[PDB]
Symmetry: D2
Subunit: 330 residues, 4 copies
């Protein structure tokens, strides 16, 4: 046993739409325990030192902020900040926990604010967050009245970060992170809303990824899909001969308008492009006195409109679509 | 869904020795939902009408007796007795529930009294009851301070009877019945004590049955094995050419002394024969004014020392054995 | 048992590179016997009546032509033509067997002539023909000195047509048609040359299709890939919202230059675009011979408004030195 | 690849009743190639040096004897005897090949002579020989007109010895030894006759062993079952607390009358106890020729105190009419 998922097994056992998941999940998580550990056991020792127990104040509406009415002792706060610092890098965020500002590589808060007006109200919805990273967005979804959030992301570090935040939240059982790829899930048709965050361009079969997402949604459910794109019409699709912005294991970069056609082909309805930006809009940069060149490593220093390989600079599009059928329970 | 096993999934999820069982159990119980229903849906409608809620008094020490300080209304008691009567036949017992005496085909109470002095104290033990029928013995095991009892018996009727008694007990979660054969279990090595009640003579491979039981026990665990036997020494073993006492699907009927050697061969220790009787010792008979011949149908009316087929009349032996190794947690 | 593949089991048993295929093929063909029969048992009764025995003359070099020195009697020829006619429609060909001109609907011979100059010589090569139809091209490949041709095509009718031609060839064991999808093959790495003709645009995962093909080739083996394409550069890729040219179950239509990049990504070498043409083809009661899938006011477009069909042929090499 | 079973794949491919075996056999033999090799690759190099080609004279009727009209040169015979000697120990036999008397440790010929009168005539029968050792009896079965003999025995050495004899027979394809346990076979119902010799008492589930054997027989086929037994009636069955006659991994030793009931329960017909004998057999430096497993003060008992070994032979029929 590296990490016990007992609490998740208990939750899905008591949920009639998720109980079928017990037919495949336990073997997958048993196998994960015996796979390459890496740093997970060292990280787990730090997680175990983070103080247990409910905080006094939680904001998951306007930010992700945890605080006590009575602040912590200088010693306990130094130790807590030091434990959290060992889990670098923190990508999604940012977080404020007992005065400590976890200053993340991404402004997930700003992207959340720009997307939220375009999505169906989360009140009482079950949500699957695919490529959920450390789980930032699941807190924001509970903040909007989500009943249940399940995150899936295969990173050991993301599971530790999530469990550290969940522990500082007092063990909130409404959000969970499973170390899985979406391809490991059976056909649940169980969630009201599915988020796919930055996964499509890593998949050799982009249409199989879109069908896998459709298969997790109830009748009339909603998909929010974010991926890297290029500018162009319905027939613009980049596939790089080697690496894209220094990344290996990259396949399809459709235009947003191309991606809209792909979603319609596999059977989604009411497809809208709701946001498109250069990725730097939502990135933070370490920009101190020691900084050499300010340009990210993945951009050409001679022309920051291009990657080091000479492709167009990264752009992120966010689409919202509907699975066919009437959405039940309002 | 015919019957939801959520509560069992929750229990084994929170138990580190039983959690591995989630790797095979859920698919088996999913398949059971879709197998031939028979009368289970009609029976379930009666179970659902049995009154919910804790009784005032429970004796599971000296009997299995349930009672309220304030007795039930004449109407509610007639309805309850009528519901319970639809689940005939009640084999293991007997039971007394709110004044209603469930007068069973077997005196499981007397056999329990004769065996109890020969078994390791049940206090804080986990127990697997193989061939558990309606689950009578699991109540008696909790009565002796067992922490946990799991019953396995593939009969639809036995699951209903057990759930009716469990409901009248106020939903006691320390005992459960799974509709499984012992051959469906993986190698758990999780129980302190295993009971095998009247299963061995139904198994084509009696040694595989004994190894399956050894595989469910912890180091130093205890087996109590009951089966049908013949008189004789270590080389006396009946295999009938067709039926035995009118029963189809019957294989090996060793002498008790033969069975002791079989247990030693597959690796058990400290094997003791603790009880041997004609089966009629522990049977009840309907013996009223209308009775034609008093002899059970399976006995020869011309010679009640023999079956109708001419084999020796049924005898039951009870053996107690130890899995090798030191038993941990005292 | 609808059809006995004993002869193919025997062939791959005696071949070192194909024997591993026996680990999965027999259960797949057992399951195929038990699937929806349709007309296959009736068709098989016609195949059983087709005359057995070697013909005197075989041309598989310039055509697919079978003849006896001494021609058949008018009765035997009427019966044989009647049996062959029961397997309509014949798409790939044409075939001429003992004077009977089989009623083929495509000129597979012209396609073959346009391909042939661009491929590595077939002498002593083993060839996998994916989407092989009734197997016309496998005969032409044997005609060019191929050691062995295996065709992959799930149609009941294609297997009957193939076995009818094979029987009239005297049971030639150097060509075989298996009713399988390419996705059912394991990683054989057994063939010198693989043809994928008209398959890629039917596959939901086109890169998994290219990897499937690479996985059937030996070191230094050759892929010939023909598919429907659009004009444009390396980022031109059409996916329809529903049908393309009135075809259902269609996915990716890259430009040939896009397809070249896809093949390089998957690990192919020396990728060449070898041929590219706008497709043409009727009933004589039709006003014109424009397919129904073309826009009648602009035949450069489909009725759905996309660019009209174009076929490209690419040739590529799996990395490594090609042995014997 | 340690040993190529291509010839067996080809044989069962061309046999209607055995072709279904291709659904499971190839993966099992692939896994066997990759299991613990031991000496098998060294042994195979000796097998490869044994001279190929048909001998002039074969007796498989009265013995197993191979000879040329023109004998081998003293050099060729020394080399061949040296190669055969590398596969020690030879248990079943004896064998005489080109004048060389193979050093067999059992008189399988006497066993064969005692069995033969009790079995249905072998002419044109297919036979499964379970626990066949180096395959001595399969030669004798062919000698009696058996169409086909398949031996089932997991020993590396047994397969080498068999293939050495088969090679000296000129590659006779009517007998084959597969390195499998009986539990690995599917339900073939393909053989006219099944032999199970010295296997039952090694099986933890003896009734599953009897059902396994019934499952390999055609309608009306015959089982010959030989095992170790005790004296007694239908309820006499020995199971040891640990070893029987110093053998580990042993389970049930029924009386022959008990075994007859077991066969009837499992659904066999016309069950006959045909033969029953107390077994005998040394090094000449031994005080006596009592096996070490016998009690020296009472050789009617094992050293463990059980009854001494006895062998019984039973013959039974699967229900149904036996075709051709």
């Amino acid at each position: 046993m590296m990490f016990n998922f007992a609490n998740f097994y208990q939750l899905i056992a008591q949920d009639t739409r998720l109980q079928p998941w017990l037919n495949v999940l336990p073997q997958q998580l048993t196998d994960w325990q015996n796979a390459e550990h890496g740093d997970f056991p060292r990280w787990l020792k730090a997680l175990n030192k983070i103080p247990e127990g409910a905080p006094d104040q939680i904001d998951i509406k306007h930010s992700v902020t945890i605080s006590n009415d009575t602040p912590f002792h200088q010693g306990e706060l130094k130790k807590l900040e030091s434990l959290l610092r060992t889990f670098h890098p923190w990508r999604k965020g940012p977080y404020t926990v007992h005065g400590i500002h976890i200053d993340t590589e991404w402004r997930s808060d700003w992207k959340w604010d720009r997307v939220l007006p375009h999505i169906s109200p989360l009140k009482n919805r079950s949500v699957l967050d695919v490529g959920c990273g450390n789980g930032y967005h699941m807190w924001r979804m509970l903040g909007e009245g989500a009943r249940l959030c399940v995150g899936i992301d295969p990173s050991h570090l993301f599971l530790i970060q999530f469990e550290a935040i969940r522990k500082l939240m007092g063990g909130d059982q409404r959000a969970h992170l499973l170390p899985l790829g979406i391809e490991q899930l059976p056909k649940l048709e169980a969630f009201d809303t599915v988020f796919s965050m930055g996964v499509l361009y890593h998949r050799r079969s982009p249409l199989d990824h879109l069908i896998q997402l459709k298969d997790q949604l109830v009748s009339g459910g909603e998909l929010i899909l974010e991926t890297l794109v290029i500018e162009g019409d319905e027939t613009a699709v980049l596939v790089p001969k080697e690496r894209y912005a220094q990344m290996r294991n990259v396949y399809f970069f459709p235009s947003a308008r191309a991606l809209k056609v792909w979603l319609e082909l596999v059977g989604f309805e009411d497809v809208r492009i709701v946001d498109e930006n250069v990725t730097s809009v939502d990135e933070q940069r370490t920009t101190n006195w020691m900084t050499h060149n300010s340009l990210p490593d993945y951009l050409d220093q001679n022309d920051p409109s291009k990657t080091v390989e000479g492709y167009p600079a990264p752009r992120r599009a966010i689409l919202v679509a509907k699975k066919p059928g009437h959405h039940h329970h309002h």
